[PDB]
Amino acid sequence: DSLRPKLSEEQQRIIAILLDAHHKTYDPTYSDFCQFRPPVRVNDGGGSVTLELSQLSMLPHLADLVSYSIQKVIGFAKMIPGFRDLTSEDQIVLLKSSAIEVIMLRSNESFTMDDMSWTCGNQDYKYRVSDVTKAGHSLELIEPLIKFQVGLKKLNLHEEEHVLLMAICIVSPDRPGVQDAALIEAIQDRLSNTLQTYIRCRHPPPGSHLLYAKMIQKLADLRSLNEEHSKQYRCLSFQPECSMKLTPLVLEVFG
């Protein structure tokens, strides 16, 4: 029987708002990047945990890039229909625990399968596995992060699907420390129902109806990458003088 309800006026308005919020908080020209502390790539190739931790040569650049992105995510979240109805305490819980996951999601826009890099664009602002190891991370995080980016690219999401998946990621009732889980779940359900309906309505063949389960599985993968990131950030934080190379926002959000 397979019903395909039309998008309601409200679901249409939710999608419009989320598209606008994303266009206002994601610059696809990367024009701010010249403001970051500059990328430095030392001869590593080894490629040597000792040398990498000794220098952390790409960390000031990539920490500035991630701090800037956290600011853009705070901005995007504040525009999600319902998010402002939450207590400021739940807003912050949700932002701090989703921040790294939304950055991984939104970075898929600059990611290219041409050479498996995040291309912002350019030459100086092209980031590879080797650049991420020069910021103190290891293959345990980087390799599955690359797998994740390829997996997501190949979903070929509509922009409507991409912005809804980010909103659903942020408003998750199962984050540690949330207080009004039912309200967050209500907001999420409204977003998830919008996404489900959108996919049925708008996505060819179909049924690549199955697309919705694939997107939910990405949200599960993101939780595992978040835990690996936390482990590695802890290690990074033990490197003497590391805090200089980070930013106050990054320090707070991650520890």
Ligand SMILES: C[C@H](CCCC(C)(C)O)[C@H]1CC[C@@H]2C(/C=C/C3=C[C@@H](O)[C@@H](CCCO)[C@H](O)C3)=CCC[C@@]21C
């Ligand atoms: C795991 C790591 C975060 C490391 C953070 C640290 C050092 C704090 O632990 C990686 C996650 C992705 C990140 C990355 C590129 C990210 C982005 C590029 C553009 O698409 C961005 C700007 C768009 C304009 O708003 C988007 O926000 C994110 C490349 C190389 C690996 C990472 C540095």
